């Protein structure tokens, strides 16, 4: 059967949970228009993250791959337009790496556009009453690193397969710490991802 | 014993007002020894106060908490102070757009809320709900109603504590604006429950 | 005929206070037959009111305007109301961190500024300077002082109008604080001058 | 030996364009034995590229920095990457509003700026000017021009480095837009002069 692969990260150091993981956990094993969703959690570590990712794309041979990360501070669900060939880290990752301006993949192209039907996804979300928008930057931390890796790997190995990235905001419990920071409940998050993934599946363009 | 909790009908534009939606589920529920009553008031200057005064008079509450919506805010906010000024960016549902007039002529400049605001904000934070104390309720209808409330309690029944909570946008309303913070109806309702129970308990 | 303008000495961290830097050029300057007198006051609860009360007695001014810094704000803000509360998130220059205490016991809950605030915001906006009326002066030393000021004038010299103005970060200040709005000293001085002239003009007959 | 520096004409609504106003004083100013040439280009898709390509052909520059307005940003921003997409919220000066079309058909997805972006941000910060690297130059005419610039340079004169700097609103402009960050004209001109000196030296 057809498989949609959805990924997320383990907690980043400080946090005790990763919301992105928590949000997709309810999707495990569910069916959408004749494809079953597989999930898989990857470490929040440069390069080691791509290894885990590649293994997952390899094992599951998915028709659609969607990675999810957390973008603390953003007000809404954001669907990434583009991944950039650059690691540049404000803080270190889970294994203590803090690369400065080094390529995700050496001699790889400057960027890859997501192949997902991004405007339709954002449109679907807005219509469902969920705030959502297209983003032009996935950042330069692990989230963008994984998005670039994904899109490159699909382009080298299985070019018909569509890949992309979705960032969720802070959970309310996390915004309590930060203080004046936007959040979204776990429940709404899980619903937003579900709507986005169905919409990604139905369409293409 | 009675806890009166109020909200507004929608600001002309919107089809609903989140604040009314959020406290509907609270009606009838028992809090320690007290029962919650709700009552919706029109979102327009001076008439709002009349409906309010009516409700306080009918229910004779031990504790009155008014709720309104503060589009743009990221979290539940509990108000510190109400100010004796109407100054309106837009008109209310009835076309009034007062500029720099008193809420109540010869009334004091301001009233402090009587609620245990910090404790409430703590209960909410502990529960994993973003919340903070605010020093401005605005100068539109919400502040109008807040100042009016506290002045009426101060005149007619000084032992009764009053105050104000602002809720952010619902998610559906933040689609419209675009890049604006929101909070689901469910979470509001839970936050208000915790907030009210805390005020009563203290 | 004297206009007293006050500002603070730098708050512990900072090496200067912009509100002070901004009003220095105004010392001795004429405005419609009045003289500007400036005075720096300590950023400490209670001691500040002492300096302030001293300066008012000394200079016997017909108009008093106090200036402070509101890191974060984008523009010039003219305060509408002073609140009778001290609530300190961090301590003052002398280690005091009062939590929910009167500025003045048994004083009224608040004081409205007696200054012509809309006309001041308008004179600023018309001269191309971003400005707006503010409904809160915070609950640190700046509001503490605004409140004491209005109280003191009300009690001793009731025809004398008082009010508070907040300036934003200087650009050098915003460098550290990363993503923060600033305004140059030059613009700040210019704004304060226009604000003060406008105040003096609409405090006549 | 010429540094070409470009800016846009006022955008439809606006009466001036801060990007142009801030580079005017730089005309013919010398920096380390190079001379600065400025040129204003239209805020129209494609037509802008034709002007740009012509200025590069005429002036034969060793360095090319394009400047633009990013209303709302708090500081000077130095762009890191240009994106091969036109996606316009509103139309350009000539009524064009492309939705999701390539800037240049069959071009690579992006170009990195060849400027020393971190060094420029550091010199600015060191000099007390707020500034930072940006990962998106938007998808309107500014990004359009950046991409065209870097692509043109790469196909015709690959030795020559190119890049983009965004400036915030002038205070004049933030008066309208209300609660908006600004930076005075003088501080912009200063910032731009330090960035270009730094870019040339490295
Ligand atoms: Cl994450
Ligand atoms: Cl409301
Ligand atoms: Cl200050
Ligand atoms: Cl521009």
């Amino acid at each position: 059967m057809k498989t949609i692969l959805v990924t997320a990260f383990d907690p980043f150091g400080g946090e005790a949970i990763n919301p992105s993981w928590e949000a997709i956990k309810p999707l495990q094993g569910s069916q959408v228009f004749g494809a079953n969703i597989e999930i898989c959690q990857i470490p929040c570590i440069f390069d080691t993250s791509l290894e885990h990712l590649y293994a997952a794309v390899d094992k599951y041979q998915p028709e659609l791959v969607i990675s999810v990360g957390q973008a603390g501070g953003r007000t809404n669900i954001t669907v990434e337009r583009v991944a950039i060939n650059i690691n540049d880290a404000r803080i270190p990752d889970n294994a203590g790496n803090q690369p400065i301006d080094t390529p995700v993949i050496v001699d790889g192209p400057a960027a890859y556009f997501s192949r997902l039907p991004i405007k339709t996804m954002v449109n679907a979300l807005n219509t469902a009453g969920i705030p959502a928008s297209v983003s032009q930057t996935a950042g330069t931390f692990v989230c963008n690193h994984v998005m670039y890796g994904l899109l490159h790997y699909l382009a080298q190995n299985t070019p018909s397969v569509r890949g992309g990235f979705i960032h969720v905001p802070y959970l309310p419990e996390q915004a309590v710490k930060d203080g004046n920071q936007s959040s979204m409940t776990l429940m709404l998050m899980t619903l937003a991802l579900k709507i986005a993934i169905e919409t990604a599946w139905k369409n293409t363009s």
Side-chain angles (χ1 to χ4, degrees), chain A:
Chain A
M1 210 192 208
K2 317 268 192 69
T3 299
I4 293 170
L5 167 69
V6 191
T7 64
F9 294 94
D10 40 69
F12 174 85
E15 307 290 353
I17 40 87
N18 197 309
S20 56
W21 176 244
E22 292 300 314
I24 71 180
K25 263 197 289 197
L27 309 187
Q28 172 75 298
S30 80
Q31 316 216 254
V32 32
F33 274 54
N36 93 283
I37 300 187
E38 284 296 350
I39 66 176
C40 205
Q41 180 171 218
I42 64 199
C44 204
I45 301 160
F46 295 98
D47 283 313
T48 278
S49 46
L50 303 169
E51 289 181 345
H52 275 58
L53 179 75
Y54 301 155
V57 164
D58 206 30
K59 153 171 169 167
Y60 281 119
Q61 300 277 299
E63 274 75 18
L64 192 56
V65 188
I66 299 192
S67 305
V68 184
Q70 165 161 247
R74 302 194 178 175
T75 56
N76 62 341
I77 295 284
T78 53
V79 184
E80 298 305 334
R81 184 171 234 139
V82 60
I84 302 296
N85 198 0
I86 197 85
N87 307 294
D88 197 30
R90 24 157 163 80
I91 57 181
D93 70 9
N94 276 345
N97 307 313
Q98 186 178 354
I100 312 308
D101 296 330
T102 77
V104 178
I105 292 173
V106 173
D107 282 340
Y112 289 89
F113 290 106
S114 170
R115 313 267 317 283
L116 297 189
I118 69 178
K119 296 295 185 57
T120 312
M121 295 158 69
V122 175
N123 282 332
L125 285 170
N126 295 341
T127 292
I130 307 178
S133 61
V134 178
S135 159
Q136 277 66 233
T137 167
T140 61
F141 202 55
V142 185
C143 299
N144 167 78
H145 174 94
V146 166
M147 188 192 176
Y148 183 95
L150 177 62
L151 291 188
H152 169 100
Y153 182 97
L154 297 178
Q156 294 282 108
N157 299 278
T158 102
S160 65
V161 168
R162 285 178 294 137
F165 206 95
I166 300 177
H167 269 120
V168 301
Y170 274 141
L171 285 177
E173 63 188 275
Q174 299 173 296
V176 168
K177 310 297 159 65
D178 278 77
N180 203 94
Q181 291 268 61
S182 310
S183 68
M184 189 174 283
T185 61
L186 184 54
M187 198 160 84
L188 181 62
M189 223 168 108
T190 288
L191 176 52
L193 288 176
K194 177 175 162 162
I195 289 173
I197 290 162
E198 284 159 342
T199 309
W201 186 240
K202 310 292 167 64
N203 318 92
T204 56
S205 356

